[PDB]
Symmetry: D2
């Protein structure tokens, strides 16, 4: 439905690269490359999207996760993005995210960053 | 590593049921059943976890997504949980979550709920 | 310090109006008018800011609260904005916010919206 | 209304101390002492609460801010708590919070922590 609209290469305001395939079943698969933080090269992502969204002009809800471990680095952390895809000439994925680091129990109060990323099809 | 510790059936404070398998590669697969909201029965989830966490007593970072569409209902929304697994006698997964609904652009300011769920191996 | 830079009239991307005075002591006082939601006219706000920020080019941390009760309406809710003031030609206050509604205990999981507002000195 | 219920000394799960007065007009004034982080002794807080909440068993919405500057320390950061007061034998204030640090523009993606604190009248 928005399978075609979501599948592809997206870029956020930080210059990160989100490469995703949307499956007919609601699956999101792909790779993420962050332009910032304790990260290098590509990381696996997986997520889900609403494969039968409302037809009233609403966006398409979706989310995905990256664990920041690959063959190069392990930042002992994971980010989830929660948001919606908005189609059209200037298609966008508007997200908020939560980045949790593994911590000791004494430090768990400072485990989680929150922010917002907007992805577009052009950098 | 925490593959065995994470795999299984978890319950949160709302009485929701999180059934997950942790793969050797960092994958999370399974099903979620919410005790609240516009939800019935099981929904697909997918996520990621740190398969090689720190050995200094830190938790294990992880996250997952549910899109709230199944064969019974479609709530045009997705939730992502971001958190850490803490092993031991009283193992826990401590999370914060973001629930994004598909909205019109005019309503996007009110698209996203935030909360926190704690999962245990016993209800 | 940024007392002069913060004091004044600010506008966000929704067309809301934030009127604030920064005190020498770190106080924020003023009024908020939301262009959206269950709101009309001005609401009291109060908050705090860092009156002696770092001199290394960092922003100035601040926050404020609105309870959505005035002489016209009571939305049984409160929003807090947490963010930083960035000075200069295009001064900005970049925030994330939490909007909590009063709920029953059974509904408390869906009590809190999260979002992000960027304020500028020009609409 | 909940003026009497809110006014007083509260303690969270970290062992922090929140001392507040609720004014008839919806004002919150007081001091905060954090048991964790870059903090020592008391800090000024100000906030707002719904002075005429619903009478249907709903909680009372409120929020407050601390800027982490006092005569002893300056952590160049501010926290806002957004939540609701629930009255009764085991009265509670259930909150989520946003802690923003002043950062450079390049580091603003990692400026804001999110968490949740529950306050009770007994430690």
């Amino acid at each position: 439905r928005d399978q075609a609209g979501i599948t592809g290469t997206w870029y956020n305001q930080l210059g990160s690269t989100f490469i995703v395939t949307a499956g007919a079943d609601g699956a999101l698969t792909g790779t993420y490359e962050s332009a910032v933080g304790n990260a290098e090269s590509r990381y696996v992502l997986t997520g889900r999207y609403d494969s039968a969204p409302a037809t009233d002009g609403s966006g398409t809800a979706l989310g995905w996760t990256v664990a920041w471990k690959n063959n190069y680095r392990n930042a002992h952390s994971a980010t989830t993005w929660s948001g919606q895809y908005v189609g059209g000439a200037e298609a966008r994925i508007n997200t908020q995210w939560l980045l949790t680091s593994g911590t000791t129990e004494a430090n768990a109060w400072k485990s989680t960053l929150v922010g917002h990323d907007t992805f577009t099809k052009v950098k």
